[PDB]
Symmetry: C3
Subunit: 209 residues, 3 copies
Amino acid sequence: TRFVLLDRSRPGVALVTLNRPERMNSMAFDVMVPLLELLGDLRHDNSVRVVILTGAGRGFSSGMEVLDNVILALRRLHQPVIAAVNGAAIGGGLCLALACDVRIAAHNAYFRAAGGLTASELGLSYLLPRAIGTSRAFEIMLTGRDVDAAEAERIGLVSRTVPDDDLLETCFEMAQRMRGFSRPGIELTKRTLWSGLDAASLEGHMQAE
Amino acid sequence: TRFVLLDRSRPGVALVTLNRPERMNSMAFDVMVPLLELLGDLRHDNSVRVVILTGAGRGFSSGMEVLDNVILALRRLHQPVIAAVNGAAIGGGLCLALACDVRIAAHNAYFRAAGGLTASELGLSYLLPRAIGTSRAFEIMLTGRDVDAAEAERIGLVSRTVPDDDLLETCFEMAQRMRGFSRPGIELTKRTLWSGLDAASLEGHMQAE
Amino acid sequence: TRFVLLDRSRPGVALVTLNRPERMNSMAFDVMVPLLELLGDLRHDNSVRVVILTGAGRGFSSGMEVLDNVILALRRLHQPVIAAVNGAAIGGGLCLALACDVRIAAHNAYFRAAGGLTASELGLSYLLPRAIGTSRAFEIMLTGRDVDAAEAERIGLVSRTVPDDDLLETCFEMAQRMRGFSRPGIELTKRTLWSGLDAASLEGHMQAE
């Protein structure tokens, strides 16, 4: 009945579930705003070392902009965010997954860019070519085709694709491994990675303080 | 007898053929300048939704700079450009293909960087690592080796590799699919993609107007 | 007994061996400083066309910063540098390999990011996502897992993976091929490639002089 659920069962992990499976967790206002407030809170929760983000039901997400705020909130966390893509990641849903630090896909997952200049398409146009190279990003976005989970793994859109039944535990297993590193160590890795993408030059980035 | 041919057989599509098969469509002045003027015209033709670019004969192209003007003209089109790489794409020819939005290769195609600071090598050095990653771009350009069509598909230099006999119709099939999207929608996708490559940061790009 | 060895057996090639196999050629001060001085000398040696960099013993390298100076010295050479990754490339060792122009791996090799804001992690965070895309770079660096030589080749972290016994000769064969191009031609290719990575835009890069 809540639009975004939080699960703190596992030590050091916050499992966040987009919860309107009826509408394929479409990123309407009443989903993205509570998500934004939760992401803000999680930033200050030092018991949480890793965030796993997933969708209730059949889809991950079918996707006055709040998506850009959410994207930057994900990036602002000192915790790594693992997207557990359990089903359809479409438009804003694909962009949300690309805003996470790691993606793992269920066999059931597929990915589509879709949709008017939106935060979603701007985010996609920045992040997708940097994930999978310009050739594949360009034709996927220009044809608007579906990318299945096997292809997503092959081309490096996700890190791994696993049986639907194994998805969350794979993510929990990865989170558990990440817990073994120090909180400031992991944070620095995440921060250098995202700022490395924006860096003007190699030398400038190496001079970062 | 014309050095660049235009074919408007298929609705919404302009098939452009580099036509000096004798010299493997080498990007001499008398080819690139008519191509440049045609690309300028196509920009204003609202009957054309998609451009397919290919070479006459055995090669795609064997490649006071006009290549840079052509590169920027391709990019300036609101229409997606599909390179139908039917054979040898060498030097300026590879750079021309990389300046298109999507590449499809015939079984017959192969790719080589070749050649004096040229627009070709500058364009390549920017575009190839962004297409296929720095490791592969660097050694392909530093060894100057041939890359066959099967490898090109594997590493994401092209989106697909198909039988020689099926090349153009695969491209027409993709163009036909792209026609289904609105003209301003497709345009925005192409524009965000190319400007995304040049963007200084994620956040700056998301603030684009 | 020297910490960095130079081998000029093969014409046009300088084979540089990191020589403290006892400590897995860890990039301590007494290794990196002589390497830095050697890289400086090699820059002025016009008999040397290609540099091959490798490690003595079982590892490539297990890795007040001098690593950043070494990184920029490698990049400053007009000669291509081929990393012959003969074993463990860990932390600064992986970053060193990523600072070379081409990587070839022995069957024996594996790669790990490891480690406090260091030149190593900054260099990695810039170079790894540009080599293999953000999805794989991010999870490899955030999980700190080992990447074996077969995977490294598959994802384009290295150009090729070969039997341990064949590693150096594969590199010598590639160097021999690179020798066939002119010294200023090869130099320009290397320079456009590295500056292309830092370029602000396609058009700006094409206007380079």
